[PDB]
Amino acid sequence: RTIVVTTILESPYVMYKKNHEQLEGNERYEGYCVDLAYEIAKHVRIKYKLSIVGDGKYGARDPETKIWNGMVGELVYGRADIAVAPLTITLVREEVIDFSKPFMSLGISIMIKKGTPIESAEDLAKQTEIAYGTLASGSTKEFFRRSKIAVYEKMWSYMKSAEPSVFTKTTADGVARVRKSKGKFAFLLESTMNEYIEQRKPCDTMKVGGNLDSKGYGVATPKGSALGNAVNLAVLKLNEQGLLDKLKNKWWYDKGEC
Amino acid sequence: RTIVVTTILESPYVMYKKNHEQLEGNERYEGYCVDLAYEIAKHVRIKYKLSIVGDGKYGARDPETKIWNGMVGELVYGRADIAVAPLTITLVREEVIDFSKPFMSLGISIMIKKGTPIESAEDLAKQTEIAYGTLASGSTKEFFRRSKIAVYEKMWSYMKSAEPSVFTKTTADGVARVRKSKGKFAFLLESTMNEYIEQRKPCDTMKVGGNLDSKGYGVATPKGSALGNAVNLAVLKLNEQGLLDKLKNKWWYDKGEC
Ligand SMILES: N[C@@H](CCC(=O)O)C(=O)O
Ligand SMILES: N[C@@H](CCC(=O)O)C(=O)O
Ligand SMILES: [Zn+2]
Ligand SMILES: [Zn+2]
Ligand SMILES: [Zn+2]
Ligand SMILES: [Zn+2]
């Protein structure tokens, strides 16, 4: 009777509490998505157990074995019932799983160390002094791999061959690299993560330029799940009653440090 | 399958949320006891529904009809399964219901408007310029009614006959009366409520002297309930893991205004 909710350790969506060692189950974790999962489960009327995705990935299909990994894989293969995470709504995923209407809007964005002479993707593409990269897996990397726009094709060509590799395993690693590189590394990531980091000490990063696209995160379920409808209606209610905005303020801005 | 939890509207234990009009069920309320009920239900493993006691009372037995009113009555007559509230552990109640070990320690205390020339119960008892009273019903009034200590007998004799009546219907009314009386009214109430008000604007009240007694609030259940053991063990765990102290800080001090 207990619904398995897959999620991913990513600040400020899901994080361990300070004393998690003496805590069990859902209590171990806190964050925006922990709060959102509680709200969904309240309104859908289900008991639930949070489960951190074993492989720490969002979800992509292996071109060789055709196997889905990450949170998407957990849903595809029936190991989880719902995903509550900053999981981007994309065509290739919508082909295999279902998504609620968006609970958060975002776009791909550029993170620089303050003072770096870059104001747009065009600025990055036309030079080589400042390296740039994305998460080693995820919808951002796929944006560049799949683009047919000249500027982004140029960026993908550079990123694919750059050494040392410009691809990072986690968002935190990419951020660390921006901070430690004296302005010679810029990180391509979602505007939501960018905005969060901008409000954290040492306050040495910034989001520059407009977003490169417009999309959203959705709460995901397996195709044909009997929970899809109620989850979607819950998300819409939470939006219209101002909860989603409240939670965004709680985890991004109310706690700000800059 | 849903356990009925009786409680009482008393700040900061239980209060309506700003938007309660668009909210249903437990979501309507917030406060220390709302948080405590959630924690108890999590650890005891039950679904639950908060229910504000209809008559707004804590619990006393009518000397005429022998009927128990308030939250105690809800438990005695089977209309609620648990009470989570600032309900004082007393002999006469322990005769009819069960209580967990204390989740909060307290004592009877004196609230004055700042500048009032009173430092103890003795100071109040020996004069008449400054009126004083208690909640019109509850364990504090019963303390004075039942005492055989000369000072408290003197106070009860005064309070019983004073006009205009010195007894108030709610804690809030007693507080208002202290604030509006230019130092000519002092209010006898539990140290917990006193400490809370002391940290609220206009910051014009204070707790004076030591406490008159030492007791505790407990989570209550009907005699012989199958939930009594697990509730008691939950309360002890919450105490030992520092949750109770955290919640006290959250609702009394972290939000302070003085
Ligand atoms: N939200 C992305 C992960 C982060 C990124 O790609 O930058 C996804 O669902 O794959
Ligand atoms: N906690 C008290 C109510 C407040 C008071 O008596 O001052 C009771 O359980 O009756
Ligand atoms: Zn750990
Ligand atoms: Zn809600
Ligand atoms: Zn109302
Ligand atoms: Zn707990």
From Swiss-Prot, chains A, B:
<feature type="topological domain" description="Extracellular">
    <location>
        <begin position="117"/>
        <end position="258"/>
    </location>
</feature>
<feature type="binding site">
    <location>
        <position position="86"/>
    </location>
    <ligand>
        <name>L-glutamate</name>
    </ligand>
</feature>
<comment type="subunit">
    <text>Homotetramer or heterotetramer of pore-forming glutamate receptor subunits. Tetramers may be formed by the dimerization of dimers. Interacts with PICK1, GRIP1 and GRIP2. Found in a complex with GRIA1, GRIA2, GRIA4, CNIH2, CNIH3, CACNG2, CACNG3, CACNG4, CACNG5, CACNG7 and CACNG8. Interacts with CACNG5. Found in a complex with GRIA1, GRIA2, GRIA4, DLG4, CACNG8 and CNIH2.</text>
</comment>
<feature type="binding site">
    <location>
        <position position="140"/>
    </location>
    <ligand>
        <name>L-glutamate</name>
    </ligand>
</feature>
<feature type="binding site">
    <location>
        <position position="93"/>
    </location>
    <ligand>
        <name>L-glutamate</name>
    </ligand>
</feature>
<feature type="binding site">
    <location>
        <position position="88"/>
    </location>
    <ligand>
        <name>L-glutamate</name>
    </ligand>
</feature>
<comment type="function">
    <text>Ionotropic glutamate receptor that functions as a ligand-gated cation channel, gated by L-glutamate and glutamatergic agonists such as alpha-amino-3-hydroxy-5-methyl-4-isoxazolepropionic acid (AMPA), quisqualic acid, and kainic acid. L-glutamate acts as an excitatory neurotransmitter at many synapses in the central nervous system and plays an important role in fast excitatory synaptic transmission by inducing long-term potentiation.</text>
</comment>
<protein>
    <recommendedName>
        <fullName>Glutamate receptor 3</fullName>
    </recommendedName>
</protein>
<feature type="disulfide bond">
    <location>
        <begin position="203"/>
        <end position="258"/>
    </location>
</feature>
<feature type="binding site">
    <location>
        <position position="139"/>
    </location>
    <ligand>
        <name>L-glutamate</name>
    </ligand>
</feature>
<comment type="similarity">
    <text>Belongs to the glutamate-gated ion channel (TC 1.A.10.1) family. GRIA3 subfamily.</text>
</comment>
<feature type="binding site">
    <location>
        <position position="190"/>
    </location>
    <ligand>
        <name>L-glutamate</name>
    </ligand>
</feature>
